[PDB]
Design a protein around this ligand. Structure first.
Ligand code: YJF
Ligand code: MG
Length: 138
């Protein structure tokens, strides 16, 4: 078990066919989780499950450039549950990130930040017990 917030180095950034796996358990009374694929201070891909935005559960995705959030993309399919173990897999493809949770496709996020080999850190934060974070080439 790792302490959050956690930084996973991504030296050489990301590349198509790279699969990033995040394993953890949602805390009781969770409010939010965040994955931040970073290029320096910019956030190429922010993946933000919100457990209680107006008594609604929603996943918010966005990009932060020069400290300004862009236009959100939202997903109401919500596979995470307080108290339960999860696996997030982020598959890098040429035109988008493809996200699966617990082996089920969840969403895609088109690349806004185009320099993938400079997205050199993944930050993992929020209301989880983080077991592990790693990647491979499939
Ligand atoms: O790491 S965190 O989870 C996090 C860290 C510490 C405590 C809690 C969470 C975390 C989330 N955030 C951001 C990020 O999620 C961003 C994505 O678009 O959304 C904004 S809220 C956004 O505000 C708009 C007005 O400007 C409003 O128009 C819009 O409707 C509404 O969605 C978030 O504040 N930064 N850090
Ligand atoms: Mg497409």
């Amino acid at each position: 078990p790792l302490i959050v917030p956690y930084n996973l180095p991504l030296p050489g950034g990301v590349v198509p066919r790279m699969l990033i796996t995040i394993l953890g358990t949602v805390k009781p009374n969770a409010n939010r989780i965040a994955l931040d694929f970073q290029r320096g201070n910019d956030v190429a891909f922010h993946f933000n499950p919100r457990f209680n935005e107006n008594n609604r559960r929603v996943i918010v995705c966005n990009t932060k450039l020069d400290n300004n959030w862009g236009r959100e993309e939202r997903q109401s399919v919500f596979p995470f549950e307080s108290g339960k173990p999860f696996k997030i897999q982020v598959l890098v493809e040429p035109d988008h990130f493809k996200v699966a949770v617990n082996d089920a496709h969840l969403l895609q996020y088109n690349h806004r930040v185009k320099k993938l080999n400079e997205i050199s850190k993944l930050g993992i934060s929020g209301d989880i017990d983080l077991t592990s974070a790693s990647y491979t080439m499939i």
